[PDB]
Symmetry: C5
Subunit: 311 residues, 5 copies
């Protein structure tokens, strides 16, 4: 119950590996995801070496309390992971094959700038603090890094689960820390977004454009203002945005533009009626006729500009 | 505290059985369900085998710490199950009969394509990882697989609780893993859906169709746009869909179609008024008269097409 | 740490009692309630017999680990109860008097057919599994069954807390199980329902009926459609129903009828205007005049029919 | 260990005290509040008495396991408190001074009859159960009852934290129970309620009253019905009431009255238009002119009656 | 397992330090934030001093139970922190260097008066209670105080993490207590507040001002009342305020003013129509023309006054 002694001056290498069993509860608002996985740890403790002939066993099994085990922690977790040691195996040379099953709620920042056509890299940071007698360094055993084929997150395509093999070794509170980056790459399943969110939102906006084929101010006021209520109501219904994001998203810009279009359509309807009442029906009719083309064209153009800027 | 030795080279068979005591908290949005059940385990350990004549006991009772017990885990659980060992009995031949009561929040994907006329198969996957000295294989004791008659899930008919007797044996992290599939078959109780969701949603759409028996543009605009607000408001009220499903559901298609119908009804109302104002009342009146039949017929037909496509 | 031996071949009787300290968090949607209570247990274990003279003490106190205690579990709980052993007293004959304070989230189905004039029977099922050496049977000590006078559930009248003295003894997984039914009878406090939910919902419906004293189609369309929006909005506000109940409730039928009435009132308004525009003001005026009586009468009648059918 | 022996036949007095460190999470809907505090306990155990000269110490420190400690529980808690023993000190005469830090979610009924001008008394009930050897009685050490100056509940003024010094001693399940009542007196901070809820609600109602300076039935219908929608929408926004309170509150009565006023204003608007259309403009104009004074006067009067009845 | 003895009569100095690893879940409504950090502790215990020559080691490692460790608690936490002792190192002179990793939900009051242009100071209060044999005093080791560069709170800029080096020593329950103040300074980054909440809210208000270029009372009533509904609906959608803050915020005043402006615009529309109907079109037209300038000017001025008063 002391770290294994060095042969020369070299640090202790703890070979790690995470195998995803379950991925669930991805909360876009909280920027958190719950994970259920295997954590494999491999290191050499020569004090544990044995002759397989004199022992009669090819492998030795130990209880966690019986031998020295490195304190591996996760950096970006809410609380410490719930762990259950599955197996501890010692081969004749003193190599330890530690395996545990754990569950953890991981905190990983999400970039919503390209939502709902966004891809995310979820992070799981492994860490080890170096001790008094010797330095502890983390390594990746890519044979031990993987994910179950049945792993799923609803509304996401899981591209890959990999690790950045080079650890981040740095000093913290006068000791070395070896940090590893495990990455879960996911891309959003944006199909139902068109018929469920985009298309009905566009229909509501198009209804407000019918005011360009009407001279009735009362009917026009009802058209633009009632559709604005319908738009807001629809947004409450589809709740596309989490509590307001601090930065400007792609969908966020489109939505802002839709509010601007409802305001401009009101200005037009107001201008039309005023000119019509102030004995100038030639201008009122020419503006309304221009708007019939101006509104869809300016919308389609601004959308192309936005799609270009974000992608 | 080592696995039982093989008589030849055969793997150890752990006979399993799950008996549902309680089923509750089925969450459609989270795709999870909470279960409270018995887990029975049976395996042969000849080190525990005894002669009854020289021992004088029917069965020997042991504490979990006293003997070797296989590490059975669940694949699709949020956290490790809360277990309470009920009984451990050993018969003269060394057959260990283990029983525990557990509670677990199970993650099982749900198919909403046919909602609210859907049926689901809830899964509970048992798993065992083989050890150094011998391979462990799972089996189903059908006598010990069942459910309490009082087991219920509000709004669901619990059809059956069975297990796929053939385990899924595969290699994972250089060891054999034996997986079992326990299935809970449930079918939704869709009756109150007609009077609570469908019928009021159809009434709001039918109100919009009264615009086909009116020439008043102001009254027509109020009819189609105000019913669209009422439709959206109603959807907020009945909250029939969870946060957006990535795929197209049956109810999802009907709802999309209802939004399309509100848009088409606006187009008609717009066309009719324009023709009337542009001194063409013959064309306007003929369109409105056609719409009176076209709208219910196209709706009833498209619904038949959708119901056919999904079922 | 083995069950007490039988004097003859008789089963071991465990006398139970539950005394409610606090009842809280009744969740109508989840069909669950949280309870805080005393669980008293009593049985004879003659191995614990002592002479009060040689011991000095008239009663002996033990730690739970020191003696055999029956494994009592609750059938309908989310997880196993949080228990705190208050006292364990052994009298010279070997009679054990066990007392624990526990908290548990109990799952009990609720019948909303007569809401908000409903009464419910909340269940707490005690259970004991029989052992190898002897059968265990549960019994009710009525002196030990009760509830604190201050026990409350907001919006409910707590009628009684009793137990069905005859246990339900049955075989499960080749062993006897003795089950007890503890019942908490509650009846809803429906007073504020009239001024808070019923009356404002009726006012909105009555506003729609003012269209029967108007010939203005535009004002009538605004009356019936805007009140329909107000009705839906009001329902969102008072959120009277949990996520859709699988069965048809009393309030559910009234609400369905209110939607039907808004649809019929639209049909009338549509018919009246069509007859007026189609040069038939005699027929239009006679329908509108009939509706003035027909609508309140048919409503009042259908409500009497519904109240009769449900109660 | 067993309870300290009586010198005569007197019960054991356990002097208590609670010092609030943190008060947080006051939930009006659940009628629950979370508390973080010190629990001090003092009693005399002559078996623990010592000579400070022969011992060399003026005070003795013990571990909880080393000595007898009374089992103090809280009556109105969700689950048993999370406790951490801070200190146990024994003086030469055998006086035990126990101190622990605990956190607990307390269940305390709230009276909303005078909301938002309400004051509440939050309760924390301490309890001790007597043993066969001797009766245990609770007492209040007022020097030990207090609260941190920084203790706060947002939107509340914390008046005082005191205890009812006389315990409630009663028999329960054949043993004496001594109960103490700790009271946290709080009064609501109702200032932002005027500009945030009342004034905008009143504005909407006043907007409906402008229909008394208009003869346009279409404009009047839009005024009263659209403001009713705005009123309902506003109440959804400010969510002033928890899930329906079983009793009639002050705000509840005002809100009911506001719905009644919207109904009466519709009746007036209906009556005025009917009289106008039925060639009686003298009667219509006289009603509308009366309403201009009748509506604000009846409102202001009924509000005075309500304020009087509730306060 | 007794505190270290004083060389003279001096109190024991416990040098503290907190290093933020993760900061997450800042809840504005609850006034809480979850933190994951290192807690370093250092004090002198001469009973632990050793000769590095006779021992062979330069540093000694101990288990928490092997030595005396001061009981450090946090004042403003929901429950006691989840702690995991990382390392305990003793140097030859008896200096103990303790390190633990903890997670805690911290309660810290938030000032929303300047939202969303507000800055907050989050507090973490360390505390130690003095013992019988000697007084314990806290100190700050600034070398051990810091935060990870990757530490983030979405929508916030983390300015600094520091500690007030002078402890607050006071008396509590007859013992001296030493308290430390750790401060996390954060400033709200809400780049998107203007486009996401302000501008759509101003557009709705501006739409209501188009009633100043219209004489149609029916169109004006629809303009001001429908925009009021749109405003309320928008506020339900953007949910900018937590459950009503007891004090008046900056955004709170702006929103109150917006409701006042909707009321004044209704008064104008009412006055204008009354004057028109009461054969005074000169006075009506002059008011409406004044309002065109009066409304934006009074709005822009009052906003400058508010921005001045709050900042
Ligand atoms: Cl961890
Ligand atoms: Cl498990
Ligand atoms: Cl239980
Ligand atoms: Cl407690
Ligand atoms: Cl703490
Ligand atoms: Na309208």
């Amino acid at each position: 119950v002391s770290p294994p002694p060095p042969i020369a001056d070299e640090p202790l290498t703890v070979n790690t590996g995470i195998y995803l069993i379950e991925s669930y509860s991805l909360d876009d608002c909280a920027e958190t995801f719950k994970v259920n996985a295997f954590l494999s740890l491999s290191w050499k403790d020569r004090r544990l070496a044995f002759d397989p002939v004199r022992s009669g066993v090819r492998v030795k099994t130990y209880e966690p309390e019986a031998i020295w085990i490195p304190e591996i922690r996760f950096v970006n977790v809410e609380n410490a992971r719930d762990a259950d040691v599955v197996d501890i195996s010692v081969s004749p040379d003193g190599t330890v094959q530690y395996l545990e099953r754990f569950s953890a709620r991981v905190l990983s920042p999400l970039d919503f700038r390209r939502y709902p056509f966004d891809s995310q890299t979820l992070h799981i940071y492994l860490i080890v603090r170096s001790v008094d007698t010797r330095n502890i360094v983390l390594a990746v055993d890519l044979e031990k890094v993987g994910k179950n084929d049945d792993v799923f997150l609803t509304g996401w395509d899981i591209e890959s689960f990999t690790a950045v093999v080079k650890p981040a070794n740095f000093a913290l509170e006068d000791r070395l820390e070896s940090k590893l980056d495990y990455q879960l790459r996911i891309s959003r399943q944006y199909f139902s977004y068109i018929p469920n969110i985009i298309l009905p939102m566009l229909f509501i906006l198009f209804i407000s454009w019918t005011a360009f084929w009407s001279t009735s101010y009362e009917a026009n006021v009802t058209l633009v203002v009632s559709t604005l209520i319908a738009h807001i109501a629809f947004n409450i219904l589809v709740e596309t945005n989490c509590p307001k994001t601090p930065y400007m998203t792609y969908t966020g810009a489109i939505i802002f533009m839709i509010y601007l279009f409802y305001f401009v359509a009101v200005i037009e309807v107001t201008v039309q009626h005023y000119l019509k009442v102030e004995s100038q029906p030639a201008r009122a009719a020419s503006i309304t006729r221009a708007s019939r083309i101006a509104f869809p064209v300016v919308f389609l153009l601004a959308n192309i500009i936005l799609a270009f800027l974000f992608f």
